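Build the 3D complex.
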Amino acid sequence: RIKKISIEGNIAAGKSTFVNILKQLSEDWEVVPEPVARWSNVGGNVLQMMYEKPERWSFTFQTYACLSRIRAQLASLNAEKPVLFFERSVYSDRYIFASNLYESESMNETEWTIYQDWHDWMNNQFGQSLELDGIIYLQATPETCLHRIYLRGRNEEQGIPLEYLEKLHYKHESWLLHRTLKTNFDYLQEVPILTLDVNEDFKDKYESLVEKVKEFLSTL
Amino acid sequence: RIKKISIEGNIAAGKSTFVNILKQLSEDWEVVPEPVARWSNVQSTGGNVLQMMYEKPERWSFTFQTYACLSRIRAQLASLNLDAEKPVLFFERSVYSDRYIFASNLYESESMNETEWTIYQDWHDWMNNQFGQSLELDGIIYLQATPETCLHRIYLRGRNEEQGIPLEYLEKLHYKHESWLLHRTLTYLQEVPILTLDVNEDFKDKYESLVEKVKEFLSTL
Ligand SMILES: O=c1ccn([C@@H]2O[C@H](COP(=O)(O)OP(=O)(O)O)[C@@H](O)[C@H]2O)c(=O)[nH]1
Ligand SMILES: O=c1ccn([C@@H]2O[C@H](COP(=O)(O)OP(=O)(O)O)[C@@H](O)[C@H]2O)c(=O)[nH]1
Ligand SMILES: Nc1nc(Cl)nc2c1ncn2[C@H]1C[C@H](O)[C@@H](CO)O1
Ligand SMILES: Nc1nc(Cl)nc2c1ncn2[C@H]1C[C@H](O)[C@@H](CO)O1
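Done.
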């Protein structure tokens, strides 16, 4: 049993940074990066198409994003205590991003219906293989994430308003901290969650965070 | 194992008519209709995405293709779970005609762009590679009708959302059928046996000869 751990967090919270750190630490730990390059060049920049015109492209983006993530995660499944760290999960795709888009009217009722039906189906076929043993929540304020967006400077992301990040933050908080967000996957209510404050730059100040992860993994 | 047979044909060629004749002819024969009622009122487990596509294909075609293909797959898979002796399952169209006739045409006509088309193909590959293995066809029956016959049959059935379909659209789909199933120029499918039936003549009360061709064809598989 490879233990499967999803790293969750708002845009530019520091997931890639954290996971690039973690993978360098044990031969028994592997990561699966979010398929961002694939979305940027399917130009066929569907990430950019969605940000530029979300009401036209959100549904299209959601379908490709989730599929590309599932493919990567399944592929990674093929050591002493192996751990697989996923950058986000099929659940954040649906219950954080897709849901917010529906709520903001970037997906209509039909698009949202078709999407949930698709996502339901995909998971009945592969829920079992990608069932998470734990979640690491990298928690950062919307303001922190907005600044880290500016820092990173992806051209597609520079139009993003603080209000968008807030909406996504509230979803993370409701799902992972308050545990009030209801999903269709009941086991997620009881999955162990490690919450890490990453408002401070941790690139060279990560010993405490890494200590917390090891302790958490040993309880699983 | 059930023999799986797709019934292929242009819009309003008479596939549902034909299949509803065949299902009455033996306990061993069952049919999987196209989920048109799911497309006309989008539900879950309401928007008319069929009408959405016809009214604005360049907005809704990709969305229609994913839903229609998933709904077809689901319907065909649920059909598998006929103790009959010589069991035959007749599919109203297949995942192949979804991709290689309909979606291909919409991309060729610029209703789907390069990104939509890439995404759809990637999606179709995976969906079929993961859930279609048990849906491989043992045979195809091609109900062949001219584009003109189809157009008048569209007008006869009188589906509201189909009334704007031009002859040229039917021609394009007709060519795709001919090329795939007759000329075999168009994707194991290169090898699947095909029965071609001419259905230009009304067959509602004159189908004995068609049915005899089908019985014989099935007896060769
Ligand atoms: O402790 C940190 C964490 C992140 N970053 C930067 O903040 C931006 C977003 O981080 P990352 O790509 O990891 O975020 P993700 O979107 O993967 O959550 C990138 O420029 C990082 O280099 C940083 O400077 N110090
Ligand atoms: O021999 C026939 C075959 C079909 N129809 C009519 O043609 C229309 C389209 O047939 P169907 O729905 O079966 O076509 P499909 O789209 O399923 O190919 C319907 O009004 C049928 O009643 C007919 O009058 N005589
Ligand atoms: N399901 C998703 N729906 C949307 Cl609209 N966006 C997403 C999704 N998953 C990742 N991103 C975005 C957030 C970042 O801008 C970028 C890399 O995480 O991709
Ligand atoms: N893959 C499909 N792509 C499109 Cl654009 N349309 C389809 C498809 N499959 C069936 N139909 C349409 C044709 C008829 O109008 C109706 C019932 O067959 O649905």
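Chain B has one domain: 1-221.
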